[PDB]
Amino acid sequence: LYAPSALVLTVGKGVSATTAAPERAVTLTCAPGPSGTHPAAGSACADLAAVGGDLNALTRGEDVMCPMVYDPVLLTVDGVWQGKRVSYERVFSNECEMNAHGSSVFAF
Amino acid sequence: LYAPSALVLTVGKGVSATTAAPERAVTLTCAPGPSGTHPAAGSACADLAAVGGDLNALTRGEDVMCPMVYDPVLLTVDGVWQGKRVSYERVFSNECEMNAHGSSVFAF
């Protein structure tokens, strides 16, 4: 047995789970190994591990430059990270911004 | 694009998400096809489809017989079923009981 690490991330244009339909959704597994529908299971897993599973501490790439659009996107993440239950959601100003937090966690 | 179907199911001995640590956790994908860490991705997918994604309507196999133990187990399911957000959790009297609701959805 190992502490489980399994998550489902969903993104949709909107500003809250009540007003943003889930357009895309990927599963992500990091224990015992990185797998799932996520485009970059490996790097995503590494992104989370480095930050200690703390989604909120994923940094915004200083050099990454995004156009100043205001087209909100709601990101949700649910499941278990190393035996601990996860339930997170954040609204980004635009996808480019979302995809700029952590190299590959949210880039799906 | 297709309406997404991606879920994470977790089970732990306890009676509420606050008091039941996630011991095991499996991801399940049903669109465009059945996949994930779930032991029976295919049948599980079929179990859900038949019931219209309505977890609460999964039936208890009339013939399935379980010993009368009282060792509760909390089952949680989160994610998206056919474009609609899912967030469900139910406490069973014992694993044998949990595994008796729907042939293979919860049998993991």
From Swiss-Prot, chains A, B:
Keyword line: Disulfide bond, Protease inhibitor, Repeat, Secreted, Serine protease inhibitor, Signal
Site for Reactive bond for subtilisin, residues: 68-69
Presence of keyword Protease: no
Segments annotated as Sequence repeats: 3-7
Disulfide bond positions: 30-45, 66-96
The keyword Hydrolase is annotated on this UniProt entry: no
Main location class: secreted
GO CC entries: extracellular region
Intracellular or extracellular location(s): Secreted
GO function term, MF aspect, one: serine-type endopeptidase inhibitor activity
Family statement drawn from the similarity comment of this UniProt entry: Belongs to the protease inhibitor I16 (SSI) family.
Purpose of the protein: Strong inhibitor of bacterial serine proteases such as subtilisin.
Subunit structure: Homodimer.
Name of the protein: Subtilisin inhibitor
Species of provenance: Streptomyces albogriseolus
Name of the encoding gene: ssi
Parent-protein start and end of this portion: 37 to 144 of 144
